[PDB]
Amino acid sequence: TAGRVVRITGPVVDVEFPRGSVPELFNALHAEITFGALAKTLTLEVAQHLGDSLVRCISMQPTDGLVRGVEVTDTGASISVPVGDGVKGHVFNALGDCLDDPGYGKDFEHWSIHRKPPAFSDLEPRTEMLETGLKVVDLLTPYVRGGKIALFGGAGVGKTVLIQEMINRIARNFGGTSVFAGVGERTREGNDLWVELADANVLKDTALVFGQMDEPPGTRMRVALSALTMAEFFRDEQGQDVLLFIDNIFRFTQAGSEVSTLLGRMPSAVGYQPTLADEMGELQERITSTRGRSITSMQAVYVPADDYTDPAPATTFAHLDATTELSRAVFSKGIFPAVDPLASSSTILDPAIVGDEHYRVAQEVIRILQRYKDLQDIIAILGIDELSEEDKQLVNRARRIERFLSQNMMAAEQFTGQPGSTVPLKETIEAFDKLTKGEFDHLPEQAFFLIGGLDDLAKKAESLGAKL
Amino acid sequence: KTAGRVVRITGPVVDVEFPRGSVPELFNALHAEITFGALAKTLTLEVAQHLGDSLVRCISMQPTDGLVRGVEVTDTGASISVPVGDGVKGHVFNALGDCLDDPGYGKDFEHWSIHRKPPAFSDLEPRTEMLETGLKVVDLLTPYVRGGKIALFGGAGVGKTVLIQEMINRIARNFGGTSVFAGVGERTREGNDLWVELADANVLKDTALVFGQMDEPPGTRMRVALSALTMAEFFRDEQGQDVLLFIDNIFRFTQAGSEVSTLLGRMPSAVGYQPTLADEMGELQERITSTRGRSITSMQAVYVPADDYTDPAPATTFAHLDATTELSRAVFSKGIFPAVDPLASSSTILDPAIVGDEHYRVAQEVIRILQRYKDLQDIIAILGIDELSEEDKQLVNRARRIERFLSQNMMAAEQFTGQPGSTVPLKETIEAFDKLTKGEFDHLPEQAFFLIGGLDDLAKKAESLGAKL
Amino acid sequence: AQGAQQIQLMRQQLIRQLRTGLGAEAVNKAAEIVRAHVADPQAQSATVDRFLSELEQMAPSSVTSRLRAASRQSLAALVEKFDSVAGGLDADGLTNLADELASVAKLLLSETALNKHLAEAPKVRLLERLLSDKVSATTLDLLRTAVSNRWSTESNLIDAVEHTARLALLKRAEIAGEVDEVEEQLFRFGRVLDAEPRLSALLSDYTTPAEGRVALLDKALTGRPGVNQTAAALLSQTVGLLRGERADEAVIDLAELAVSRRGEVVAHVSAAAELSDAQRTRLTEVLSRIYGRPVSVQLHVDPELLGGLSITVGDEVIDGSIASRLAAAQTGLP
Amino acid sequence: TISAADIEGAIEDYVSSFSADTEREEIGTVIDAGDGIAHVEGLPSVMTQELLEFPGGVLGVALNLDEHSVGAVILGEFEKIEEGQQVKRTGEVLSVPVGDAFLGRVVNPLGQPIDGQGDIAAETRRALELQAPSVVQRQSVSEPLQTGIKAIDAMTPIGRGQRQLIIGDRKTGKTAVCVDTILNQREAWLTGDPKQQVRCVYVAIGQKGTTIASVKRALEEGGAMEYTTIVAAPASDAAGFKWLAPYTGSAIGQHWMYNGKHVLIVFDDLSKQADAYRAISLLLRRPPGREAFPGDVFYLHSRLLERCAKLSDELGGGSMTGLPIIETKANDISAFIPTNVISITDGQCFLESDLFNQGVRPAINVGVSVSRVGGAAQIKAMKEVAGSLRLDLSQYRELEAFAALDAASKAQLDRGARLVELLKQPQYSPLAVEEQVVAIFLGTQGHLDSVPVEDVQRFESELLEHVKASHSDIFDGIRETKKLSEEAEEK
Amino acid sequence: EVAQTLTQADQQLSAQGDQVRSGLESSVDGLSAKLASRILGVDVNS
Ligand SMILES: Nc1ncnc2c1ncn2[C@@H]1O[C@H](COP(=O)(O)OP(=O)(O)OP(=O)(O)O)[C@@H](O)[C@H]1O
Ligand SMILES: Nc1ncnc2c1ncn2[C@@H]1O[C@H](COP(=O)(O)OP(=O)(O)OP(=O)(O)O)[C@@H](O)[C@H]1O
Ligand SMILES: Nc1ncnc2c1ncn2[C@@H]1O[C@H](COP(=O)(O)OP(=O)(O)O)[C@@H](O)[C@H]1O
């Protein structure tokens, strides 16, 4: 009553079964590669029923060395991963195999990685600021406790550095559990994160699930689901606050699109799978805080070729409560974190939640920066003197504000040698209220570059001669 | 019998069924007959694919109009071959090797298959030796390599063929070796003009002409280059002669390959090109090369579709060249001839180690000035030079004079303008452009630098315009 | 230094061209020498004996694909039931059953609508209401059993009925005790068809009427003084029930099916010339040992092999051709 | 004239060698072929990616496996394939010989020599698709790989085990950077210490043959071939070799990396690998994606570049540093392959033609270039002197654009101009790490503020020469202790 | 000077190769005979 391999084309494998023994959709099947140099056990996830007792499956491991006709065994259940407090402090792969301690967690309770999202009647909007000590984030994109946070950005703009910074600034003193899903990213970064968490002593409270970019598309599709299953167990069963870090969530979509045509699906616009939005919706709707059970999730969303209109990030946008959007233009200026204050957003950025003063200051900053963006071209072509005195004042104010929104982050020390700094929310609001009022117009704009609070500003201006 | 029969005909591509055990090998030449009166002929088909069930897909070298399903097809047992030897010099041939000016000529010559592997890697020797042409822009900014590969990129009507004729005039006339000209997918009247001109200049006796032109099926257009290359290869290998291989236009070979691939049923690549675009380009180009002790100086005209240098064809062509002269529509519009883009053209031997420190320094200063001029074009287009600083104004005047001076009254341009061409020694070019960069001609009018040779012509034209040098 | 390095490189290159020229001439003249040597028949016999030996020392190993699961199971059930049922029928009954089944198969081919609507108990009732008396009782039983199961593709039904007709013809041949005769005749016919690819291709065009090609085969190859009647009829109905497959392919398939029913397997052995009867017995013994089951051996004469054996079964070949060894050695000289 | 031993004794050795044992094996049959692809019926036991032996010594690789047939890519000499030919299993997936004999040799993607210098003695064989090191088999990148280029070494430092992408338009100095990086390892090679030695692999994909010869000559002149291997897949090679060569080079490098050695692998360039893989996939009729590329092109590059890694001490501590090259088109980094590779590697060095024409050579675009290892891949002295150089230059470029002033702004513009002049460097002129430290010290500490901009370069040069003529203890101290002591700073 | 050295070396090595080709023809017969013996798995007199 076991099937056999019929067709092999990269990560997609067709398997024939006896009538009445066709595995259910998403069941995990086991095949064997007996070639010595690559001997292994292939896990195949049933993707489609092709009729005539054939099923199309997506391999989790590489199919090199697989032979047509080899026996395929149906496990009778979907891919399941270990759950419980025991997964904290260890590294797993998409299938739940422990990496640092092979064989560990084999006897834990196992949960299917395929799960329906919480019922709508259980949902409750989350409106509660999550202070981070980052001036730009706290002022213009206030994060939400138990909300959904994304860091959009192109390749190499600082998404990972900002994830690590938020792990430092949030997960260090976090009272609950942390789950980090490395999805289709660099193995070196995974090792670095593992070592850094061990050094910070945060590993004992964190479960790491890694499926890197060298893995086949199936692993990159399902690693996010595995990590989300662990986080869901912590949320629902243990009744504990959870921190869910995902880097990079776009790799889930990309892996899905890599196999879309091999599964026989007509491609959609921009080469994506037709089921882009639906698969994204299932995954993202699983990542949520239900009434009384909190998940504070922070995802890094890769924006291909810096094109924010690309279907992937464009579809992802709908699933977030706060979005910090990193810009290539800001990055190339040396402003760090390379946040685009004119494009980022937060649902709790309104007078009701953050208070009148915070909202007024943030709106004034945004107005000034928008005006500066409007005048950029005129300044470049006709120079500055052709602007009105009011616009010259605004341009100076805007340049100083733009520099001050930069900050020396802890996780960025390795790249600058300058130890990071933290700025309380009240200090940020007061400092930017002073900036928008032209209080610090006498200081050079360079004094505002990569500093923390107002004391740092005074110190750096003094090092430059100017007096605050 | 061991003969096949036509089963499918789709344009210049024909499927032929053979008895099992008689399936021709890939690239074999087959012969079929068209009997209809007006179009009666003998089709030469080249085996391109094995389809299974003893079917072969073949490319026709002549139009298949009038061909009938079921006609007999005979396998010659060998690929297309062309005559080789000193006898091919002075004569005009087609892709199949038939002589056009003297039909039936060369049938008794040695015949070489037009398909062969490129030279072994251990036989390849990099060539770093400047081939001086007398053109200021070419000599200064994109020096040509003797025994190397030169390309002239350009859109439609920017002066690719005129520049090819210019290089024939400058390099081929005073050449002791053999020249092979390959007209590929170009105007037939251009071929007739070249033939007449070569006869007039007494260069034909040292030249072999192979023409497969626009009004040909894609198979002929994509195999004529191989035929001419085979003639050049015989001259290089079997006779130890210096060879000049002129090709115009290689993009036509690529485009014919694309049409053939569409006919063959292959899945299109980007921009509709054949999936095996880079590979066909590579085989053809790597057959064009100078081995150790055996020199081929090849010059190829590359058409750029819709002035799109990003198009896959020229983009893949770029990697096979030692020197690249990229003609620009922008430069052409200003009346500058040759319409070379100094900032886009390049040469692998423009380094101080090969051309000396003076040549390199002068060329780099010219390029820096022109780049700074191009960077200011945004401001100048809106406001003019008046808003630029004094340093920028001075650089802009210097750059405009330099860009005028890179133009030259070409030898082949006499037929258009009526003015005789000029040759400029390399040392004079270096010295003149050194003075231009320093600013020793900042007082002459710009028009004094337009379409002249060396500094003597500059002085004379300045005097005519009322200035003094 | 560059000049000296180039001199060394060209010296080595010339040495290598000389080396490869010596290799080419040496291999060519060694090939000629061996071709001359093998002309002795006792040399061929000794080579065959050596290869047979190698076959004995070489240790054994434990180890209809086009059909799918549903079609395969249906065909297996139908053939088993046919063997159980029709075995007791008389030779004349077997001939009548085979003719009726062939007629049924050609009819079903003529109208594909019925096959389409039937591949997916009422099937039987339809069969009696259609052709209850047009076919004998045994033929109707076999046809109703055939339609009893389902088929992955409608073509599998016509394939199954053709298989049943072939089985009936083979059964009548066996009852007469001439299974070996029909097997040898089928193998020879396949051999000659393969020898003349043009004739096979001409016969392979299903577009032309079946009757014309059947008459061609009868008055060209099938109908001759030294042809078994059963083989003649089997091949005739096979060519008449053709669906674009090459005639040689159909003939070899029929031979394979016949030997499969015999319980053995086919083994096509090629050699420069025919081998002695003792050599034949030894080869059969070693093949049966190596594959663990009795295997019929069919001899092909082709001097190009210049000795040895080229046994092939189940898509795997054990080659002893002297020409193959010569080519391998030729490619073995860098 | 001839030793008469190899020429004559080779045949005797070969005949003594041709055992030619009888083999029982599955044979398939070619059913159709053309353009470098071939379909083979039979071979029921063939593996995915298995190597197949066609007649005449032609090799293929089984890529598509279905019930009907097997679609295979021919690895050269595809014109000898005919319908009906016999195809033989090899029983192995793609693998190449590996060993120390490959140093100084030019080979094809199968490991066979093409330099015409004789057979290579292979230590062993290695499959091309072995898994990359896991998360727990690595360690942090902490050893600097000195390229000798001031801009790269001070602003986008490369550590051992890092993947740094050299991306730019054609004729922007990408190969110049990579070859200079290879040549800069000569000093480390001569020390003889395997912990400092870097063995180099240069993969040429789709390059003109004479250009590969030019690279080989440039390496021979600088003594680089003593520790360098070249894997060549010139433009005339079959699309199979172009698709396969980076994997062959990676396997050759991995053999050394897993044996405690440090390897630098250059891919020149991955754009042509992607083109060849797209050609193969289209000929196999696999559905295409953006720019007709197969859906798994990102996987193609990612699994290749993830084998460049720094191994943990338990695995010997070896490393393989990757230097993939990408040729952008019209300076667009938004294209498919450039975006994929940029998202794969550990930073990038963007080379721009506009910067190159201005005299900024190497034409590193400071603002968008970055190293993702950072100070960890630098010695202490370089970190201190060049702590914030990249961001300083980004600010300088932004302010230069704005200014089209205040005293502070003028000071910033002057300092930035001096730093930009400082980072310029000729070709084939590497700088030792200590010289780089001193030059960057001059630039950043302000000692060039008193020098005219156009003089900076000359000044720098002369001053370094001075320190080599006398006061050489500064270079010695920097080189030995890896940090500039405050006493050495004062001196 | 390097061109002259290359030319004279070309002539000398061409003569060397011609002489070697002439000389080597004596022993090739033994090579081919032993190859025939091996591929026939038995000693061959010729
Ligand atoms: N040096 C020159 N002096 C004057 N006119 C010139 C010169 N070069 C080109 N032209 C003009 O430009 C026209 C185009 O020249 P040419 O046919 O060589 O261009 P091309 O790029 O080969 O064109 P096409 O794409 O049509 O083949 C010439 O007919 C002539 O009118
Ligand atoms: N630092 C440098 N200083 C001066 N010239 C340089 C420098 N780097 C490279 N060049 C020169 O620039 C030209 C282009 O360099 P190179 O061939 O390395 O570039 P590339 O991007 O690899 O080009 P391609 O696309 O042709 O392969 C060559 O002449 C090289 O000598
Ligand atoms: N806050 C920062 N300060 C200084 N450099 C930074 C900062 N953030 C990012 N960078 C630089 O940008 C690079 C890309 O950041 P990273 O987040 O690792 O990549 P990505 O944004 O693509 O995930 C880093 O390697 C680092 O050199």
Ligand SMILES: [Mg+2]
């Ligand atoms: Mg990242």
Ligand SMILES: [Mg+2]
């Ligand atoms: Mg033209």
Ligand SMILES: [Mg+2]
């Ligand atoms: Mg290069």
